[PDB]
Amino acid sequence: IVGGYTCGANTVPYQVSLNSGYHFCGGSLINSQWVVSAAHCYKSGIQVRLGEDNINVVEGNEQFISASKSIVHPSYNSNTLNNDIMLIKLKSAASLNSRVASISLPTSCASAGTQCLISGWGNTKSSGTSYPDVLKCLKAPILSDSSCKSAYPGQITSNMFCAGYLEGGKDSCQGDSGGPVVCSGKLQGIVSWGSGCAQKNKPGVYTKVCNYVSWIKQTIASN
């Protein structure tokens, strides 16, 4: 997260870190056994880390649970990043508490202009590299479909939306990938892609979760 703020320990209790020997992507806990992340975050040997603030210090509220299964969207296209969504099932149920909690799925898609909360342990610089230890947050508005399509001509599908600030300075970034965009209490986006980070006229692009609630529910009902 570029241009963001320190969230405060455990104030984003649905935020997970995916670890394969190191933090490599975010995710969102949607019930005690399931995490939503980005398909482009697929790797084998994932450990889900719940209840994290400082990802490099054991602070006492963590739950580390291995993935039992990963399910990339059937229509995920890594070339275009269309359908950039994946489910991760945990080997054991998380213990839900004040610091580890699920986030609601959407029933309807989010309004343009809605201020949403994006979070993660990704790069905090727009030029150069600095990865934070503690969880960073950013409040960012959903942009109009027209301004999103203008920004990335030919590349935006109905399964994507843009959010952020056209003037630059505030954005999600590498390492935040797979993490949540929460609007009005619902998981409406997943951190997916963008041209650089926090650059003028190049806003963040997010998976539009409300297009996937039927697949999410059917998959969790069968696995």
Q: Which of 37, 84, 176, 192 is catalytic?
A: 84
- Quote the CA–CA distance of 196 and 204 in Å, as a whole number: 9
177 annotated ligand binder: yes
Those residues whose C-beta lies under 8 Å from the C-beta of residue 44, and which sit 6 or more positions away, are: 20, 70
Question: Is 172 among the annotated ligand-binding positions?
Answer: yes
Question: Catalytic: 70?
Answer: no
| Residue 40 annotated to the active site | yes
Q: Which of 90, 110, 116 is nearest to 172 (CA)?
A: 116
Q: Any known ligand binding at 97?
A: no
Q: Please identify which residue in the block is written with the tokens 């359908």.
A: 83
Closest CB to Ca ion among residues 53, 84? 53
Binding mask 54-93 for Ca ion (x = CB under 5 A): x----x----------------------------------
Q: Which tokens in the block code for residue 137? A: 């947050």
Residue 126 among the catalytic residues: no
Round to whole Å and give the CA distance between 96 and 90.
Answer: 13
- The annotation status of 52 as a binding-site residue, yes or no, is yes
Instruction: Lay out the site mask for Ca ion across 162-201 (x = CB under 5 A, - = otherwise).
Output: ----------------------------------------
**Which among 187, 133, 181, 140 has a CA at the least distance from the CA of 4?**
140
CB of 216 to Ca ion, least distance (A): 28
- Region of 52 on the Ramachandran plot (φ > 0 left; ψ -120 to 50 alpha; else beta): beta
Stretch that binds Ca ion, among 25-33, 46-54, 111-119, 147-155 (CB under 5 A): 46-54
The helix, strand and coil proportions of the chain, stated in percent and rounded to the nearest 5, come to: 10, 35, 55
Structure tokens at 106: 């959407």
Check binding of 52 to Ca ion (CB under 5 A): yes
121: DSSP letter: S
Side-by-side strand order, sheet with 136-141: 5-6, 136-141, 115-120, 180-183, 186-193, 204-208, 160-163
Q: Is 62 annotated as a binding residue?
A: yes
24 or 215: CB nearest Ca ion? 24
Count interface residues toward Ca ion (CB under 5 A): 3
Mark the binding-site residues for Ca(2+), compressed into ranges: 52, 54, 57, 62
Residues making up the binding site:
52, 54, 57, 62, 171-172, 174-175, 177
Active site residues: 40, 84, 177
Positions in the binding site for Ca ion (CB under 5 A) = 52, 54, 59
